[PDB]
Amino acid sequence: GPLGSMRTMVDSGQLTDPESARGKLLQTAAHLFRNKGFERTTVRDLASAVGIQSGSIFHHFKSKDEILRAVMEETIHYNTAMMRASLEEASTVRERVLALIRCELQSIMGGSGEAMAVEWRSLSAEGQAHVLALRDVYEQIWLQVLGEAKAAGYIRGDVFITRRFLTGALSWTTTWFRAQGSLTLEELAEEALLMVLKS
Amino acid sequence: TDPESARGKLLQTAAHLFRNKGFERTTVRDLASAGSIFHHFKSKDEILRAVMEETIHYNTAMMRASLEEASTVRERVLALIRCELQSIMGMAVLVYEWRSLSAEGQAHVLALRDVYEQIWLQVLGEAKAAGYIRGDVFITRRFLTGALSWTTTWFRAQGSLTLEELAEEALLMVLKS
């Protein structure tokens, strides 16, 4: 089950327990990097906010750049794994597309927010390398599922162009969704499905 | 307004000044040195107003012209898509200086903006009534708005994809069989 696939991520050391020592650092660092800037935040600022000695951070990260990398990778890994979980809950081709639309909207409207909005211009290149690899996996899932829909005859246009259109359509929702007031995210997801798929 | 006329030249230089520098720190001097500028406009606000208004005027007129050439509901949606993509890939001063306008300037720009979106809603409305759109008209427009504006991030990297072909792909997604 999808819960089990998430658990496997936990028992791979890929996802971090929020109430664990490492989780405390990541959670706080994300807050600090977000609403105070990465360049302004120091390692000792992180330790102070958490409530530990500045020397005990070396146990977990051994560098500030690696804290930023861990904050970004954790958030992407979680999001991607949650898309996979939602896909396992889907039963048809339409529900699989809807699963991806709904997941992306949830992140767009808040997820993780702090650890998602965060400083690419201050992350290293080797750190940029693995993050880009994670982004490729994320987009791979979109392309595969959209590819399934096209094979089933729900998409007449190009799969890659379709994803690019849908990327823009969904991200632009930050500018108008709250103003609707009564529209739920689930209703929003169904509308996006109506747009991009047939029948 | 003819872009080769004295006015057209002025709006372009002013729009360029307003973008990178900003309205506040744009001076009378650099507006007058790029001074026929005082013979065309009565105030600095009036210049900023004309910069935004004529852009919307131009975009709106181009859409109306394309709609009259279209003779099917599918050709009419495509005409709007092609026109908006053209403006997009070709308007930024507004969403980067909105405050500096007078009450009358703001009022008129919003009204122009309403007529623009009215055209979209009416054409999309036709498509839905004809059975080409299955979703809500207003939400379809908002989806299409983001889909088309996001094309600035990837279109220039495609190389072999024409903007016409891009519009056709947009049409394929937004309209039913």
Author numbering:
A (entry chain A): -4 to 113, 117 to 197
B (entry chain B): 11 to 44, 50 to 105, 111 to 197
From the paper:
A novel enteric T cell superantigen, I2, and its full-length gene product pfiT, are encoded by a microbial gene associated with Crohn's disease (CD). Crystal structure of pfiT at high resolution revealed that pfiT belongs to the bacterial transcription factor family of tetracycline repressor (TetR). We show that pfiT specifically and directly interacts with class II MHC HLA-DR, and to a lesser extent HLA-DP or HLA-DQ, and show that pfiT shares an overlapping binding site on HLA-DR1 with other superantigens. We show that pfiT can stimulate the activation of both mouse splenocytes and human peripheral blood mononuclear cells (PBMCs).
Based upon the high resolution crystal structure of pfiT, we found that pfiT belongs to the TetR transcription regulator protein family. The TetR family members are key players in multidrug resistance, virulence, and pathogenicity processes caused by bacterial pathogens. They act as repressors by binding to consecutive DNA major grooves through the N-terminal DBDs. TetR proteins function as a dimer to bind their DNA elements. Our results demonstrated that pfiT exists as a dimer in solution; and crystal structure also confirmed that pfiT is a dimer at structural level. An apparent molecular mass of 48 KDa was obtained with a local root-mean-square (rms) deviation of 0.007 OD and a global χ2 of 1.5, with molecular mass being the only fitting parameter. This value is in good agreement with the theoretically calculated mass of 45 KDa for a pfiT dimer, suggesting again that pfiT exists as a dimer in solution. Our structural study indicated that the structures of both pfiT and MAM are completely helical, although pfiT displays a different folding pattern. The distinct structure of pfiT relative to other SAgs suggests that it represents a novel family of SAg.
